[PDB]
Structure 1
Amino acid sequence: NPIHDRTSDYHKYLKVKQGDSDLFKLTVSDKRYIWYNPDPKERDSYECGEIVSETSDSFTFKTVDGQDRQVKKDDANQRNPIKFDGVEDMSELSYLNEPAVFHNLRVRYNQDLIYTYSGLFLVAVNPFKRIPIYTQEMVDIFKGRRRNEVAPHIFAISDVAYRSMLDDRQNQSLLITGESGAGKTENTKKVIQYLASVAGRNGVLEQQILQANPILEAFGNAKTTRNNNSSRFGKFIEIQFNNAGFISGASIQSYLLEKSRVVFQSETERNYHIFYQLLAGATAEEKKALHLAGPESFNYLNQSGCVDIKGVSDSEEFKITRQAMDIVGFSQEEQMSIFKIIAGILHLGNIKFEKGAGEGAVLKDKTALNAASTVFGVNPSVLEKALMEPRILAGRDLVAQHLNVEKSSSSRDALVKALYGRLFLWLVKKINNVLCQERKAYFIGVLDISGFEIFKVNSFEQLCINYTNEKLQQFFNHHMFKLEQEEYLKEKINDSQATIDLIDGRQPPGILALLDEQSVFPNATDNTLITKLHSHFSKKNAKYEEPRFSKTEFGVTHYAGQVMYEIQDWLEKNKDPLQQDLELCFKDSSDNVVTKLFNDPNIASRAFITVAAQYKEQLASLMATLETTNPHFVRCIIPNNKQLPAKLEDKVVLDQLRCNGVLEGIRITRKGFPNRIIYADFVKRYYLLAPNVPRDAEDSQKATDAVLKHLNIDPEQYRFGITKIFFRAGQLARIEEARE
């Protein structure tokens, strides 16, 4: 049993190394330390100072350089005794302050232990290097093991959820959030791998479920400056089981796909993988039929300066993508058309509009336009007209307008984005057709979405994702509350709304409601909207802030701190408009897939309700599902902003812990009886402290109370529970600090 064999990879890779002795005496020391900021020239930077003296109210300690510093006891960030360095659950720490928390994580990370629990959370820190802990052999060890029985691991929580499902006959969910590059998708792939193995039918389905993700990653992921394989969409995966606990199906819900990346990428960034995949991967024959060329030949791929990802073979990836498509069930016809769509979008992007003639646009050369039409299976003349001379309703009149270049290009871009987003939707729907079962007994759903987003510039998409995160954090908060009460009961012992409403309130109206309102008027502008927003909430709603000088931004006080959003283009983003003429053009496509994107109301349209109203609706459905499950929380954290291993940056790390709810949870916990130990566990270690108790007594509680009594500990500091002894913050450390 690798769990008992100190020489296994299980041991090397997932546990703190254990030597011969276990004895208390080993960790004994006179030294008491404190965590201090060697400079409030930082604040996540701390150093360990050794208390060299104390007064009845403050401590005095030496710095690294040797300087004596003084601290208020009540302000001291006491260092936990050495024995706690490395614990698998932060809930086991006696002193729960921030630096203390960061220290435990760091000690673990330094040994390549990337997983650590924090109470109900599993904290996962990207190592930025491959650690061989996800082999079948590792899968096996986690089978049927309790949380307390094995090292922290994504497989562990996956197991705990599968067992809960079977035992409680209750659906479950794993919410995996955090920053781009944190490891959400990776951990999500592991959850599914684990499940397919512990519950799979020793298989076509399983194979299909597994191959679905590669398909979706090809079309929804792209290299960004934060992740070579960034998910540009969020997702909720339902892994479906029958009542015997075998995988019976699956479903995928996608959200907020970044359609704009199709038409623009920042420097060093890439468009979606697929484009590169098809271009590298297509057969010298397919190219001819697709009018393909190198990336440098396409405006949609030649602006960023990066057409390739280090250590990635687009051609090889294409092969994997086509394979998945085959496994899942996409017909080669269907497959050709998908590629046609990709090709077509690239041709659309190579369309150059020119002026002069007047103020209106024209197409001198039509090669691009033609290539695009050929691939799409639409009429080039119909296309050309719909782009530059769409018929617009003037109330009674339906008159064609001659758009200028700008407007013309914008339109083209809109066409591309609609094509891309609809295609994606269609892909999801197709995958669901194959995988999904209307006949499921139970499910375990996985949500892999970003956590709060606070960038240099925050826009409509950020507001959406942050709104979701306010709801998830509040979901967490409510849950922690139940679970903690429960705990206390079992042993016999003792702001989101406001932000939420500001955003999605109906009466008085919140941001999205005012946004929808403005959305009804053709002539509204960025300025009309922001003024309206300030009008309703500036100095009037406590979570809102009108800026001192900017005229195009506004701030929302979020759980994670204030976020400033800029309003540019919000009206447009809310309506996501597409000229009706273009809809007409495409509805007549001779392509089999194309036609679905424009003639299936479930793909071609929202309801119509705005983008905001749809987002709010989708989010409420999601929450509603979640509410029916037993949830599990994984907070993935990036160690630094450079994608490097062995470089865990305190400020980078603490800031994520402040935003993702881990430190708040601990704050909450630290206040009561953070430490809770099984009687026998206590004696096993502390027996030697009292002139009385036998390491292995049969009256474990008594035994406990014995030691306690010996030590004259303050009764207020602990609580006799049915199966464990509950200890207030710090108590346990002092106990540990006790002479034998």
Structure 2
Amino acid sequence: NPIHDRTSDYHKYLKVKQGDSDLFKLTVSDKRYIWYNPDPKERDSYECGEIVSETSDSFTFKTVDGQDRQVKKDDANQRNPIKFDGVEDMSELSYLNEPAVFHNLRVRYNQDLIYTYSGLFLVAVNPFKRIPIYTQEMVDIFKGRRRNEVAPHIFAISDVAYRSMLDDRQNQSLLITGESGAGKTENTKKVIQYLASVAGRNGVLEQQILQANPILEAFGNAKTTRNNNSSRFGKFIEIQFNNAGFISGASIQSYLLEKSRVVFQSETERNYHIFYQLLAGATAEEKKALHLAGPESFNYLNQSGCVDIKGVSDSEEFKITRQAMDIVGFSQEEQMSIFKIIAGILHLGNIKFEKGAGEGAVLKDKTALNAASTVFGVNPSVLEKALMEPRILAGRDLVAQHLNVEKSSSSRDALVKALYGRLFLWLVKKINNVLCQERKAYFIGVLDISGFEIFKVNSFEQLCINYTNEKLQQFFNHHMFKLEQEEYLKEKINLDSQATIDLIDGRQPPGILALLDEQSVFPNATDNTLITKLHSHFSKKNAKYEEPRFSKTEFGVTHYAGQVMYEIQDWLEKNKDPLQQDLELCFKDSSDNVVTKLFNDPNIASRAFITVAAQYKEQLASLMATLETTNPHFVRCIIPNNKQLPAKLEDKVVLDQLRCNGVLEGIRITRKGFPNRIIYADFVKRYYLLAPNVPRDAEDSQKATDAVLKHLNIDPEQYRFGITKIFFRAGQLARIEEARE
């Protein structure tokens, strides 16, 4: 049992290395430390100062350089005794302050221990290197072990969920969130891997379930400045099981796909992987049939100045993507058409519009246009017309308009985005068709989506994601509450989300989205109309809203994670996501078999119509409805720094996430009552020697406990006798630790 074999990789890689002795005496020390900011020239930078003295109200400690500073006891961040360095649950800490929390994480991280619990959460720090803890052999050690039984790990939480499902006959959910680059996806893949193995039918299905996300990754992921393999869409994976506990199917729901990246990427970034895959991977012959060239030959791929990802073979990935498609069940025909769509898009991006003639646009060279038309199988003349001379309803009149180059170009861009988003939607639907069962008994759903987003520039998509996150954090809050109450009950012992939530999705009075939708009805409304309406209703009138001192195009929202300033540019457009009807018409007649679906299947071609905001709101409520029916599990992924480097855990970077994702707040909350709770025998096992009476392995554990306690003359208010554990208040246990044997 690797778990008992101190020489195993299990031990090497997932546990704090255990020496020969276990004895208390070992960790003994006179020295008492404190966590201090060597400079409020920082406030997450801290050093450990040793307390060299104290007064009845404040401590005095040395600093690193040797300077004596003074602290208020009620302001000191006491450092936990060394025995606590490396515990598996932060709930085990006596002193639960910020620096102390970060320090435990860090000690663990320094030993490549990327997983640590914090009460209800599993906290996972990206190591930025591959630790060999996800082998089948690692899978097997986790089978059926309780939380307290094995080291912290994503496999552990997944096991706890599967057992819960089976035992309570209740659906479950794993919510995996945090910043881009944090490892959400990485961990989500490990959750699927695990389940397919502890519950798979020793199979085609399973293989298809696994080969499903590589298809989605090719189409939904891209290299950004924060992750070479960034998920540009959010997802909820339902893993379906029969009553016997075997995987029976699966379903995927995608959200917020970044269609905009198709037509533009920042410097060093890449467009979606598939473009590159096709281009590299296609057969000399397929190129000719697709009018394919190098990435440099395509405006949609030649602008950022990055057409390749280090250590990534686009050609080899193509092979992998195609294989996946093969496995899921995409027909070769279907696959051609999918590639055709990718090709056509590339062609659409290469169309050059010119003016002069007048104020109107024209197409002097039509190579590009013709290229896209062939691959899509639509009429280039019809296409051309729909591009620059769409017919617009001027009341009763249906007249064609001659668009300028700009307008012309943007329209082109909107056609590309709709084709991309619809394909994505169709691929998701194709895959669900295969995997998905109408006959499911139970499910474990996996949400891999970003946590709060607070960028230099915040736009509509950030408000959306942040809106979701206010809901998820309020859901965890409710959940912590119940579970916390429950514990207390079982042992015999003793917000604000709404307001932000309402400001965003409120109907009466109307909140942001409501107002946005309203403006959305008027063809002539502008960003200015919009921001002015927002300020009118909320500036100085809604406590979670802020009108900027000078910006005219932004507004701020006080979120759970702090204020977020948003820019209103293009919100109206984004809310309607328009596409010229004539473009719809052109493509509706497409001779292509996949293309026809994207335009003729109301379920793909249309939202409902309702606005983008209204759809986001409805989809978020459905998700939450689901979640509400599960027993949830929370994974908080954390990026150690902004450089994608191993062995470089940056305090400021880390602390900031801990503050935003709910970890430190929950600790704050916890720390207030009886954060430490220990199994009677566990307690004696360790502190027997502290009392002149007590046998290490006593049968009357509680007594034994009271014993020690009494010996020590500890203050009764600081502890609580529970039915199976001894409940301790903050710092009590550390002092205890600090006791002479």
TM bracket, shorter-chain basis: over 0.9
Measure, in 1, the Cα distance between the counterparts of 2:185 and 2:33.
39
Other structure's SS at 1:290 match: coil
CA shift for structure 1 position 65: 0.1
CA shift for structure 1 position 696: 0.2
Measure, in 1, the Cα distance between the counterparts of 2:657 and 2:570.
30
CA shift for structure 1 position 659: 0.1
CA shift for structure 1 position 680: 0.0
CA shift for structure 1 position 637: 0.1
Unaligned runs of 5+ in 2: none
Measure, in 2, the Cα distance between the counterparts of 1:444 and 1:10.
26
**Residues 456-502 of structure 1 deviation map (CA, whole Å, 9 limit, x = unaligned):** 00000000000000000000000000000000000000000000000
Other structure's SS at 2:5 match: coil
CA shift for structure 1 position 96: 0.1
**Residues 542-578 of structure 1 deviation map (CA, whole Å, 9 limit, x = unaligned):** 0000000000000000000000000000000000000
CA shift for structure 1 position 360: 0.1
Measure, in 2, the Cα distance between the counterparts of 1:689 and 1:142.
36
CA shift for structure 1 position 24: 0.1
Measure, in 1, the Cα distance between the counterparts of 2:74 and 2:186.
42
CA shift for structure 1 position 287: 0.1
**Residues 585-631 of structure 1 deviation map (CA, whole Å, 9 limit, x = unaligned):** 00000000000000000000000000000000000000000000000
Other structure's SS at 1:191 match: helix
Unaligned runs of 5+ in 1: none
CA shift for structure 1 position 11: 0.0
CA shift for structure 1 position 192: 0.1
**Residues 289-315 of structure 1 deviation map (CA, whole Å, 9 limit, x = unaligned):** 000000000000000000000000000
1:671 maps onto 2:672 in alignment: yes
Other structure's SS at 1:362 match: coil
Measure, in 2, the Cα distance between the counterparts of 1:228 and 1:708.
55
CA shift for structure 1 position 253: 0.1
CA shift for structure 1 position 403: 0.1
Measure, in 2, the Cα distance between the counterparts of 1:612 and 1:148.
43
Measure, in 2, the Cα distance between the counterparts of 1:395 and 1:427.
38
CA shift for structure 1 position 129: 0.3
- Displacement over 2 Å in runs of 4+: none
CA shift for structure 1 position 632: 0.1
Q: In the alignment, what sits opposite 1:653?
A: 654
**Residues 387-444 of structure 1 deviation map (CA, whole Å, 9 limit, x = unaligned):** 0000000110000000000000000000000000000000000000000000000000
Q: In the alignment, what sits opposite 2:484?
A: 484
Measure, in 2, the Cα distance between the counterparts of 1:276 and 1:640.
28
Compute the RMSD of aligned alpha carbons. Answer: 0.1
Measure, in 1, the Cα distance between the counterparts of 2:268 and 2:414.
24
Q: Count matched residues.
A: 740
**Residues 127-160 of structure 1 deviation map (CA, whole Å, 9 limit, x = unaligned):** 0000000000000000000000000000000000
CA shift for structure 1 position 694: 0.1
Q: In the alignment, what sits opposite 1:680?
A: 681
Q: In the alignment, what sits opposite 2:25?
A: 25
Other structure's SS at 2:322 match: helix
Q: In the alignment, what sits opposite 1:725?
A: 726
Measure, in 2, the Cα distance between the counterparts of 1:25 and 1:232.
53
**Residues 93-130 of structure 1 deviation map (CA, whole Å, 9 limit, x = unaligned):** 00000000000000000000000000000000000000
CA shift for structure 1 position 88: 0.1
**Residues 634-692 of structure 1 deviation map (CA, whole Å, 9 limit, x = unaligned):** 00000000000000000000000000000000000000000000000000000000000
CA shift for structure 1 position 80: 0.1
1:609 maps onto 2:645 in alignment: no
Other structure's SS at 2:251 match: strand
**Residues 189-218 of structure 1 deviation map (CA, whole Å, 9 limit, x = unaligned):** 000000000000000000000000000000
Other structure's SS at 1:315 match: helix
Q: TM-score, normalised by structure 1?
A: 1.00
Q: In the alignment, what sits opposite 1:691?
A: 692
**Residues 225-271 of structure 1 deviation map (CA, whole Å, 9 limit, x = unaligned):** 00000000000000000000000000000000000000000000000
Measure, in 1, the Cα distance between the counterparts of 2:387 and 2:371.
15
Other structure's SS at 2:289 match: helix
CA shift for structure 1 position 383: 0.1
CA shift for structure 1 position 46: 0.2
**Residues 306-345 of structure 1 deviation map (CA, whole Å, 9 limit, x = unaligned):** 0000000000000000000000000000000000000000
Measure, in 2, the Cα distance between the counterparts of 1:206 and 1:420.
28
CA shift for structure 1 position 165: 0.1
Measure, in 2, the Cα distance between the counterparts of 1:203 and 1:11.
32
CA shift for structure 1 position 346: 0.1
Measure, in 2, the Cα distance between the counterparts of 1:115 and 1:170.
26
CA shift for structure 1 position 353: 0.1
Measure, in 2, the Cα distance between the counterparts of 1:150 and 1:6.
13
Percent identity, aligned pairs only, is 100
Measure, in 2, the Cα distance between the counterparts of 1:680 and 1:256.
51
**Residues 493-540 of structure 1 deviation map (CA, whole Å, 9 limit, x = unaligned):** 000000000000000000000000000000000000000000000000
Q: In the alignment, what sits opposite 1:103?
A: 103
Measure, in 2, the Cα distance between the counterparts of 1:242 and 1:5.
35
Measure, in 1, the Cα distance between the counterparts of 2:471 and 2:398.
44
Q: In the alignment, what sits opposite 1:137?
A: 137
Measure, in 2, the Cα distance between the counterparts of 1:612 and 1:154.
34
CA shift for structure 1 position 74: 0.1
Q: In the alignment, what sits opposite 1:248?
A: 248
**Residues 66-111 of structure 1 deviation map (CA, whole Å, 9 limit, x = unaligned):** 0000000000000000000000000000000000000000000000
Measure, in 2, the Cα distance between the counterparts of 1:475 and 1:252.
21
1:355 maps onto 2:355 in alignment: yes
CA shift for structure 1 position 186: 0.4
Q: In the alignment, what sits opposite 2:572?
A: 571
Measure, in 2, the Cα distance between the counterparts of 1:537 and 1:727.
45
Other structure's SS at 2:310 match: coil
Measure, in 1, the Cα distance between the counterparts of 2:612 and 2:155.
37
Measure, in 1, the Cα distance between the counterparts of 2:239 and 2:81.
43
